[PDB]
Structure 1
Amino acid sequence: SGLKKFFPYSTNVLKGAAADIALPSLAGKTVFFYFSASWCPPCRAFTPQLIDFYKAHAEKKNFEVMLISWDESAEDFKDYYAKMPWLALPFEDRKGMEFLTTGFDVKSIPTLVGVEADSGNIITTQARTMVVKDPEAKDFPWPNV
Structure 2
Amino acid sequence: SQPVFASPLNVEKRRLNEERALMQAQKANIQLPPNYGDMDLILFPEGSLKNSNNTVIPQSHLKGKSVALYFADGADPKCASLLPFLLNYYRTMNEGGANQKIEIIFVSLDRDREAFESHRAHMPWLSIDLENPLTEILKRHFRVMKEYEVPTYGYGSRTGVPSVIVIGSDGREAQFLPICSGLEEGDRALLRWDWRNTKFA
TM over 0.5: yes
- Which whole-Å deviations, capped at 9, do the CAs of 1:9-34 have from their partners, x for residues lacking one? x6231211322211121011111100
Mapped partners of 1:66, 1:131: distance in 2: 19
Tell me the CA shift for residue 58 of structure 1. 3.5
- CA shift at 1:99, angstroms? 1.1
Match of 1:124 in 2: 175
Give per-residue Cα distances to partners, 1:11-67, cap 9 Å, x unaligned.
231211322211121011111100001111011110111000001113557110010
Q: Which residue of 72, 75, 96 maps to 2:134?
A: 96
Distance 1:140 1:131 in 2: 16
Q: Choose from 122, 125, 130 the match for 1:86.
A: 125
Whole-Å separation in 1 of the counterparts to 2:75 and 2:102: 26
Return the index of the structure with the highest Cα Rg: 2
Q: Are residues 131 and 45 of structure 1, via their aligned partners in 2, closer, same or farther at CA, if it must alter by over 3 Å?
A: closer
SS at match of 1:90: coil
- Alignment CA distance shift 1:81-1:64 (3 Å): same
Q: Return the letter of the residue paired with 1:77.
A: F
Q: What CA distance in whole angstroms lies between the structure 1 residues aligned with 2:87 and 2:189?
A: 15
Cα deviations by residue, 1:79-126 (Å, 9 ceiling, x for unpaired): 101101101001221x21111101011131101110135x65421232
Gaps (5+ residues) in structure 1?
none
**Aligned counterparts, 1:9-20, within 5 A:** 11-20=47-56
Cα distance between partner residues in 2 of 1:18 and 1:42: 27
Scaled by the length of structure 1, what TM-score is found? 0.79
Greater RCO, 1 or 2 (C-alpha within 8 Å, sep 6+) = 1
Decide which structure has greater strand share: 1
Measured in 1, the distance between the counterparts of 2:71 and 2:91 equals 19
Question: CA separation of 1:89/1:4 partners in 2, compared to 1, >3 Å: closer, same or farther?
Answer: same
* Residue matched to 2:165: 113
Q: Is the contact between residue 123 and residue 141 of structure 1 (CA under 8 Å) also seen in structure 2?
A: no
Moved more, 48-57 or 123-132: 123-132
Q: In structure 2, do the counterparts of structure 1 residues 19 and 2 end up closer, same or farther at CA, with 3 Å as the change threshold?
A: farther
